[PDB]
């Protein structure tokens, strides 16, 4: 059913949560410098998941947001996923400008979640996931590069098809189909370049003003 | 008519239940977190206790989405199976061993003994070892959870010309005869944290996928017996 979809999308926020709670429980609660901030995040994520379940049991909600530190926030949650508990670095290279863009926040945060999952999951044996936020031509470009298993150039098309998975562990293959679905739904475009064994780079373009 | 309709109706109530059964731990979660954010975290006497409850609830929903995902995969037919000839006897024995050894490492809340009564023949049978061992696991888990203290889980591996039978017997409080049909339905729980109401549902699904058939006999106040039947030669 469409149940399979909520099943899939709750995965990464459940992870974010379990990861943060485990951090607080492992002592961070005693630390006044951080424990509140973590609590705000666990709160925000729980509320996110509730919204998610409600919209999918019973539309887009476009609002203007500051893409820069939304992307920073998502990346923060993953930084905390990769801590606690191969080594991965999230190398961030954003423009210093604050690019504002019309999007659905929960849907788009789901997109970034899937693509960081991909960049990380198909990167065993370590890696450096490199995240770039820039703009040209009234478009806002996000790129995510990993030193993963790459993609055979034959399949570079099919990675956005439903259930389509490469040969080589895990998943139903609806991550990138949902991602493409959402990105096109927001008036933007998504694509991938990749070199088998080298790594990969995922791109999203969104209209700017 | 009622053909297509039973299908669509079952589907829509399953969606309604997934909505609720997912949403409810999220709600509980929200309440504890919100409590912690509103000061409880500064309090050493309560903050750990709350953090454990929130940890556990989160783990619960994770297991649930794993099971709702394997269930989607099985309805879809996406669920690939690998039938291979394996030794049912020592597979069932290895399962029982893992359970014996969890309780052999102590101190335990409740105490149970696993009584094994197997046929002496070495039954070789084509099955997917991993999915079927998951089945045996849910049913043993179940057998254990609804057991009294000192209870005896009675596990039988036997055979008939036509069949290979596994039974898992518990001395729990049994199942109302109204509900004997419903015990394998999704999210169906008798009363009841501790787990998702998808254990037995997955079990029945997997067993039918492996070509066998699964059912329950039970007497209120006495206990229960779960049966798995597999085709033999
Ligand atoms: N960095 C990456 N490197 C190599 N392959 C990738 C990468 N990201 C996505 N893919 C490919 O996309 C396929 C399916 O993607 P996805 O929808 O995310 O599946 P899943 O259900 O596991 O989440 C995968 O088989 C994978 O090979």
Numbering used by the authors:
A (entry chain B): 384 to 441, 451 to 477, 482 to 564, 570 to 610
B (entry chain A): 372 to 477, 479 to 564, 570 to 610
Give sentences copied directly from the paper behind this entry.
Here, we sought to determine the crystal structures of a WalK homologue, lpWalK from Lactobacillus plantarum, which shares 60% sequence identity in the DHp and CA domains to our previous solved smVicK structure, in different conformations in the presence of ATP analogues or ADP.
The adenine plane of ADP is sandwiched by Tyr518 from the N box on one side and by Ile547 from the G1 box and Phe603 from β7 on the other, and is further fixed by a hydrogen bond between Asp542 and the amine at adenine C6. The β-phosphate (βP) forms hydrogen bonds to Gly572 and Thr573 from the G2 box. ATP/ADP fits into the active site of the CA domain through extensive interactions involving the N box and the G1 and G2 loops. In agreement with these results, a recent report has indicated that ADP rather than AMP is an efficient VicK kinase inhibitor.
